[PDB]
Amino acid sequence: SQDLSEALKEATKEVHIRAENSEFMRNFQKGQVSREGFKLVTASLYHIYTALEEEIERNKQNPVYAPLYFPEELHRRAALEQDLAFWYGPHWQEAIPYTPATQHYVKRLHEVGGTHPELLVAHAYTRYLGDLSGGQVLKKIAQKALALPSSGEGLASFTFPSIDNPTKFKQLYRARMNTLELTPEVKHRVTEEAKTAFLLNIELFEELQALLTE
Numbered sequence: 699s700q701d702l703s704e705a706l707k708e709a710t711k712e713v714h715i716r717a718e719n720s721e722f723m724r725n726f727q728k729g730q731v732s733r734e735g736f737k738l739v740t741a742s743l744y745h746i747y748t749a750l751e752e753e754i755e756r757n758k759q760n761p762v763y764a765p766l767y768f769p770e771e772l773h774r775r776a777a778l779e780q781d782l783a784f785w786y787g788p789h790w791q792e793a794i795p796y797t798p799a800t801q802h803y804v805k806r807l808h809e810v811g812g813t814h815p816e817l818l819v820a821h822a823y824t825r826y827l828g829d830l831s832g833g834q835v836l837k838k839i840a841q842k843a844l845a846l847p848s849s850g851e852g853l854a855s856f857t858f859p860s861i862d863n864p865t866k867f868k869q870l871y872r873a874r875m876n877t878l879e880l881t882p883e884v885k886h887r888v889t890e891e892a893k894t895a896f897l898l899n900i901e902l903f904e905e906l907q908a909l910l911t912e
């Protein structure tokens with residue numbers, strides 16, 4: 699479509715359905731998630747967000763990204779560290795895995811943030827708006843399926859205390875995205891990089907599912 703936010707939604711509709719149909723997610727939605735599986739994804743995401751937010755800080759002043767800088771509201775690295783500490787203990791840093799698919803994703807995140815800053819939006823969009831959407835549904839399912847503390851320990855990465863209303867916040871995020879100045883061509887490169895982003899997540903779920911099956 700014309701507005702970037704609409705073009706992104708249109709461009710990733712197919713890979714989104716594919717992400718929901720991935721074995722790992724299908725099971726998660728139906729309440730079939732294990733402590734081992736949840737630990738795995740959380741660990742993998744700690745790396746992805748670490749790399750992602752490291753690149754964001756690098757371009758927080760770059761006009762091609764500046765409008766999407768929301769450290770207090772969205773940044774997930776700290777929350778993920780809290781979950782990892784809960785699941786793996788004080789020495790989580792050294793106990794957590796770093797799978798091939800996660801590294802491949804982290805790599806892409808450094809390339810983009812490093813030399814293609816105008817595409818970082820595609821990656822932030824894919825992870826953050828997803829956390830505020832499907833993530834909100836999954837959060838509730840996980841607390842039940844994993845019989846977690848009613849206080850929220852273990853699910854801090856799904857919690858955005860600095861956001862009163864995710865739905866409302868996403869509309870504001872879309873507004874900001876449509877504020878970005880870029881040619882139709884670069885805009886296409888953006889929607890195209892968001893598919894790549896979903897594909898990196900898909901590949902990551904397929905790998906973890908493969909790792910878990912045993």
Ligand code: HEM
Nearest residue numbers: 706707717718723727823824825827828830831832896899
């Ligand atoms: C358990 C599987 C999933 C379910 C059930 C799900 C469900 C949804 C729903 C219902 C929406 C629409 C907004 C809302 O009403 O909340 C949405 C949006 C979105 N999801 Fe997912 N989702 C899932 C997995 C994912 C994954 C794995 C990603 C990314 C890696 C993702 C990324 C997004 C994005 C970026 C949007 C916003 C699209 C836009 O409006 O431009 N989702 N999801």
